[PDB]
Design an enzyme around this catalytic site. Structure first.
Site, PDB file in Angstrom:
ATOM      1  N   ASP A   1     -13.754 -51.682  45.589  1.00 57.17           N
ATOM      2  CA  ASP A   1     -13.495 -51.048  46.883  1.00 57.17           C
ATOM      3  C   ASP A   1     -14.433 -51.629  47.964  1.00 57.17           C
ATOM      4  O   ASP A   1     -14.113 -52.649  48.596  1.00 57.17           O
ATOM      5  CB  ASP A   1     -13.638 -49.522  46.740  1.00 57.17           C
ATOM      6  CG  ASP A   1     -13.335 -48.748  48.028  1.00 57.17           C
ATOM      7  OD1 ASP A   1     -13.398 -47.496  47.979  1.00 57.17           O
ATOM      8  OD2 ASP A   1     -13.037 -49.361  49.080  1.00 57.17           O
TER       9      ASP A   1
ATOM     10  N   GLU B   1     -12.569 -47.307  39.403  1.00 56.54           N
ATOM     11  CA  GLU B   1     -12.884 -47.760  40.738  1.00 56.54           C
ATOM     12  C   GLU B   1     -14.389 -47.784  41.046  1.00 56.54           C
ATOM     13  O   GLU B   1     -15.074 -46.765  40.917  1.00 56.54           O
ATOM     14  CB  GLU B   1     -12.127 -46.921  41.777  1.00 56.54           C
ATOM     15  CG  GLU B   1     -12.016 -47.615  43.109  1.00 56.54           C
ATOM     16  CD  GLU B   1     -11.469 -46.716  44.200  1.00 56.54           C
ATOM     17  OE1 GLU B   1     -10.634 -45.838  43.906  1.00 56.54           O
ATOM     18  OE2 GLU B   1     -11.895 -46.899  45.357  1.00 56.54           O
TER      19      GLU B   1
ATOM     20  N   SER C   1      -5.007 -38.141  44.710  1.00 61.64           N
ATOM     21  CA  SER C   1      -6.432 -38.158  44.357  1.00 61.64           C
ATOM     22  C   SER C   1      -6.933 -36.748  44.067  1.00 61.64           C
ATOM     23  O   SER C   1      -6.794 -35.873  44.892  1.00 61.64           O
ATOM     24  CB  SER C   1      -7.269 -38.760  45.485  1.00 61.64           C
ATOM     25  OG  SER C   1      -6.773 -40.047  45.825  1.00 61.64           O
TER      26      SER C   1
ATOM     27  N   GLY D   1      -7.081 -45.109  51.213  1.00 61.69           N
ATOM     28  CA  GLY D   1      -6.944 -44.174  52.313  1.00 61.69           C
ATOM     29  C   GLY D   1      -8.310 -43.738  52.809  1.00 61.69           C
ATOM     30  O   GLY D   1      -9.316 -43.896  52.114  1.00 61.69           O
TER      31      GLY D   1
ATOM     32  N   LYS E   1      -8.395 -51.609  51.875  1.00 60.86           N
ATOM     33  CA  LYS E   1      -8.394 -50.775  53.061  1.00 60.86           C
ATOM     34  C   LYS E   1      -8.433 -51.708  54.256  1.00 60.86           C
ATOM     35  O   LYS E   1      -9.338 -52.516  54.380  1.00 60.86           O
ATOM     36  CB  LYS E   1      -9.589 -49.819  53.045  1.00 60.86           C
ATOM     37  CG  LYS E   1      -9.485 -48.729  51.955  1.00 60.86           C
ATOM     38  CD  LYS E   1     -10.776 -47.887  51.867  1.00 60.86           C
ATOM     39  CE  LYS E   1     -10.651 -46.868  50.737  1.00 60.86           C
ATOM     40  NZ  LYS E   1     -11.865 -46.031  50.500  1.00 60.86           N
TER      41      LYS E   1
ATOM     42  N   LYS F   1      -5.182 -40.195  40.309  1.00 65.06           N
ATOM     43  CA  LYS F   1      -6.576 -40.609  40.376  1.00 65.06           C
ATOM     44  C   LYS F   1      -7.493 -39.415  40.164  1.00 65.06           C
ATOM     45  O   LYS F   1      -7.399 -38.439  40.907  1.00 65.06           O
ATOM     46  CB  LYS F   1      -6.879 -41.231  41.745  1.00 65.06           C
ATOM     47  CG  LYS F   1      -8.369 -41.612  41.936  1.00 65.06           C
ATOM     48  CD  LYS F   1      -8.782 -41.673  43.434  1.00 65.06           C
ATOM     49  CE  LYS F   1      -7.933 -42.690  44.227  1.00 65.06           C
ATOM     50  NZ  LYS F   1      -8.184 -42.637  45.699  1.00 65.06           N
TER      51      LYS F   1
ATOM     52  N   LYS G   1     -11.369 -38.179  40.331  1.00 60.14           N
ATOM     53  CA  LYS G   1     -12.787 -38.322  40.629  1.00 60.14           C
ATOM     54  C   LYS G   1     -13.591 -37.966  39.364  1.00 60.14           C
ATOM     55  O   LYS G   1     -13.324 -36.940  38.711  1.00 60.14           O
ATOM     56  CB  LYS G   1     -13.151 -37.384  41.776  1.00 60.14           C
ATOM     57  CG  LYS G   1     -14.634 -37.186  42.016  1.00 60.14           C
ATOM     58  CD  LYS G   1     -15.301 -38.384  42.651  1.00 60.14           C
ATOM     59  CE  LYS G   1     -16.736 -38.039  43.030  1.00 60.14           C
ATOM     60  NZ  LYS G   1     -16.838 -37.130  44.227  1.00 60.14           N
TER      61      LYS G   1
ATOM     62  N   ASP H   1     -11.898 -42.555  39.932  1.00 55.68           N
ATOM     63  CA  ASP H   1     -12.799 -42.966  40.987  1.00 55.68           C
ATOM     64  C   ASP H   1     -14.227 -42.631  40.547  1.00 55.68           C
ATOM     65  O   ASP H   1     -14.607 -41.463  40.498  1.00 55.68           O
ATOM     66  CB  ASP H   1     -12.461 -42.252  42.299  1.00 55.68           C
ATOM     67  CG  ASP H   1     -13.322 -42.743  43.462  1.00 55.68           C
ATOM     68  OD1 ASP H   1     -14.258 -43.550  43.228  1.00 55.68           O
ATOM     69  OD2 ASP H   1     -13.057 -42.326  44.602  1.00 55.68           O
TER      70      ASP H   1
END
EC number: 5.1.1.-
Lengths: 360, 360, 360, 360
Positions: free
Chosen positions: D230, D205, D127, D282, D254, D153, D155, D180
């Protein structure tokens, strides 16, 4: 007049490829003539769910006792006499198709003619497996175009789809190009498959699960390339559900998978009522199955080329006396009553693994 | 094998009823046999759009010249040879259905049998014209229930639709009962029609416009009684569209309305693939048309009783030699090749008003 | 830790009823214990598509060679090792469910417990075959209501479906009552089936085709009684599709039909995630299959009574040592590791018609 | 056998980052073994709604008194014993997950194994937070590709989305790239997000509100890039609703957010029934939570890489004795019963902010 089924033979051949193929045959005897059909189920359930052991046990313990010694108006009457039993459409097709052949032969009429076809040749396409790279793909496409095939089918898989299609279409801007996606994809692959859209494929064959229609309908909403159904169309009501759900716009019609000629013509007609074409799928058939396929293909909604290419492409030597050879992508209809082909009984005897006869 | 159409006769007969009936007949000659079919179009376009003047002109000016002196593999090839002309299905049907009779006679096979049917008798109901009141109704019906007819059909209109049904229904609590709402309705009358719901009608036949599917689909949503389509389904694709729309759950299948036997089989199969039954409609036919109807009706999705009641109900003398009489609401299939019936030529001559012969 | 499958036995037994029952058993041997499962496929494909000949051939020729001599972390790894073969879920189930019994026995844990269930007894109903009339019905039922069975299920057909229900219902106004419409219906019969609505049936089981979801979804829209699916749900994804479609509100979950315990848990969980309950179906099992069923049924979404009635209803003597008897419509979970039951080997030997052992 | 929970410890650690992280742990004692789990709720409700103060008060005043001294068949039985209480899924997860670990340890079996997984390594992704510019983004992507991560990933935020993605994809045409979106967008942003489509992201996401499914479904209609859910998937029924609504095609799973391992496997299976993948999210976990995560990730529908990267990336020193280090983007499953990791009690003692013990 009515026909009486007096005897049945099951002959299982192991036919040398051009390793070997197990070829289950049913021969039905009546009225001084005989009907022959070929099973398309495998030793193990790989293409679909049926097996040789299951199917032959069902023939010898159930279907044959139900028809031997009985008298029938037509092949629909034969099929009807089975009827209670669930699925097992390829096993059923052996009886039904042999019945079509025998019935046509009591009348002296070619089989496609009794089914309503009046084409004298059917268009054939070619199927290419996965090649090493793009220039190998294109070289082989170039060959098959030169030979006169009227449709090119490329086998594709995740990691090797957009590339072979792109290379092929660049070299051949106008050919009729399709792909066989072989149920190897998922809905997460919609973006990758949508990248095929700019290459104007006639269809993508059964990309998602083999028994699915619902997810295929979702996938057809996400991409513009038409979907072609194979394994998930096993009946006219499947075909109706597929087309109505928008699962696909084309059907790969395999006669034995749907249960024989009567139901196949029903699938063909249901498609047509939707203005959707069908085409004849193949299953590595000996000349018995190829000949049944060619007659079915004479029906008018077989508007895309079928996998009934030259027998010599498959076999050093075929189970029938007649050569089934396509020229310039046209396969002639074999002449004569029923299928218009004839087993070579002595050649057949050299490759017979097992045989049996049954009577009332 | 193949058949050459050598001559064609158009013979127009008039039969008094039991007001009257013009029977346009087509006789096709080939290979030492003949096929005969009967036109279901009217002098004036009251039930649908075709007229006798229009149809015969189309036969003699277009259809017959396309076929005379030509050789055909099957009836499908005959139909194919007529060309791309639009509509005029009943006209087409005359040629097509005569070609089926002729073809089946060259084979020596019953017509039904070649279309895939193996029933030996068919269930029949009766349709009764409009009734003067809620006791006379219960009585003309009674006469038919006493005869073992397996469905009673009543013409209706507003405001004589609902009371008859509750009438007959309480006075015959258990009979299969239906109405032919006779397109005397629009969506406005939808409330009047929901009143029929409690009386377990098998269906309400063609309540709205003769050419409509869309409004019927809306109406079907608002009432619980299934809708049956007649006039609005003139092909297998109309049938597909009607059923996909939810325009009806039942189709009244008239062979000549949809252009003949092959298309009728297709309609029959499209319906079965949606899980919808068909039943055989009537057009006041002589024994030629009635016999064609009986053979079509042997197909498996004819799961509801048809309008094919006894010939003696209609004519003091029919145009064929054989009787076509039901007993206990079962019509047997007339024996012999093709239709299994035979023009009474001497009697036919006495009621003929026009005749003509055409050759190549 | 891990387990090695060292041997496998296929034992075929026949048990007379109370007509008869072939019980194909699979015994897997490893780590000083054994797991046993029972095949639910029939000699002939009447309830669904698999046959005993087909399944045993698949076990001995394909599945057993894939596992014998191999070491596995869990039953999921066993299933994974069988490969991509299509359908044949009951066959798969034999291996998979035997592997669950074996695995649980190496741990010393009850099977239910490892699948996430913590019920100690399960509610059960009874399904009754077809009844000769509207008093005999009310009486064979009575015998089962006197036993405290928590749901009564009746087979049906037309036109013996509706009167029995109003019958039993008025003669037992308060009992949980359901029908197994036995796929003896098509959408045509939808009107007949709405008649059942007033009689608060918990559900109507599989009214339409055994392989259908789409027509059931249409039927569910037209009647108020919930539909329960049996034959048409053979996997967790079929369950998802059925429920997303609105094909049913209830699933009859048969462990072997969906390919075993892990997939059954998945089906169970997919249903619960749609707010749909499951209940446990029956296939006339010996105590092996009945015990597997009881353990699966301990999971929380088994919120309706199952077909797992007392063994003594079926056999004068069962193949296991332990009784499996319900009291007041509660079946207790048989104590011990895995299934908590044990083959009666001496008795088993007296009814064995085939046996074989396979090793690496 | 059943396990009895005799004691519970709550230990709150302040673990130095590589400032500090508050790590709440629950330790459950029974049968001579112990189960350990890690809370993922924060001091303040930022990621979702729960807090350390609320969750620990709920443990010590409600959940622990409900289970201490009680005997249980399995972890599902433990969860069930809480049950009345609404939401608080991360608090519940502490108990449930510690129960999974303790139960697995009474049996001597790794945790993933009892959940049905059989992978020995799981794929890990990386990430990246927002960088200053494009060449800084690409340089860091270049590094992580070289290290072997199997998903990147990024952001993103309004004003910085299309640019970093475009730059990355240009430099890396084939890597698996995701973003994300961190709930920072609205439906007015559909045009901007649709500009991501040409870069073939595996998913975006949770772009819209954290507790939304309905607007995400509208957004998925406007863009072709798959949406990944999510925060709005906190249960199997949420997962079902999401996939059925078309809110997304991928789920960031998660384990604590959804309430623990049992419900996580339910989410995983519901997704699979839709043919939708899940992947392991995570939450900056110490080795206790990372180890639980790695075992969950061994299940087969974890088909995209998870955020269970090397522990050393997060902590100068971890709470467990075992190193959890990924090599070439593969994290090995820690060996041993349950989670296969072990608290370092003396190291733990040096970073303990608060601890307490509870008994029946």
């Amino acid at each position: 007049r009515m026909f009486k089924i007096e005897a049945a033979e099951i002959v299982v051949a192991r036919l040398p490829l051009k390793t070997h193929k197990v070829v289950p045959l049913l021969i039905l005897h009546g009225e001084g003539v005989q009907g022959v059909a070929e099973g398309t189920m495998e030793a193990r359930p790989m293409y679909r769910e049926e097996t040789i052991a299951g199917a032959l046990d069902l023939l010898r313990g159930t279907f044959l006792p139900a028809i031997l010694g009985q008298t029938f108006a037509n092949p629909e009457a034969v099929s009807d006499a089975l009827g209670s039993y669930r699925g097992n459409r390829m096993a059923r097709a052996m009886v039904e198709m042999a019945a079509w052949d025998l019935w046509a032969r009591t009348l002296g009429v070619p089989l496609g003619t009794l089914l309503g076809g009046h084409k004298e040749q059917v268009e054939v396409g070619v199927s290419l497996g996965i090649q090493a790279d793009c220039q190998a793909t294109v070289d082989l496409v170039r060959r098959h175009v030169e030979q006169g095939y009227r449709r090119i089918k490329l086998k594709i898989k995740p990691g090797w789809d957009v590339q072979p299609v792109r290379c092929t279409r660049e070299a051949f801007p106008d050919i009729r190009l399709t792909v066989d996606a072989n149920s190897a994809y998922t809905l997460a692959d919609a973006g990758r498959l949508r990248q095929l859209d700019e290459y104007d494929l006639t269809y993508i064959e059964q990309p998602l699960a083999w028994d699915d229609l619902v997810d295929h309908a979702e996938l057809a909403r996400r991409i513009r390339t038409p979907l072609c159904l194979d394994e998930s169309v096993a009946s006219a009501s499947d075909a109706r559900k597929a087309l109505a759900l928008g699962a696909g716009g084309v059907i790969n019609l395999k006669v034995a998978r749907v249960g024989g000629h009567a139901e196949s013509r029903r699938v063909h007609d249901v498609a047509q009522s939707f203005g959707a074409p069908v085409w004849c799928g193949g299953m590595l058939e000996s000349g018995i199955g190829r000949a049944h396929n060619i007659h079915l293909s004479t029906l008018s909604n077989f508007r895309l080329p079928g996998d009934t290419s030259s027998a010599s492409r498959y076999w050093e030597r075929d189970l029938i006396q007649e050569p089934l050879e396509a020229v310039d992508g046209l396969m002639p209809v074999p002449q004569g009553p029923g299928t218009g082909v004839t087993l070579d009984r002595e050649f057949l005897a050299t490759v017979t693994e097992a045989q049996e006869e049954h009577r009332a």
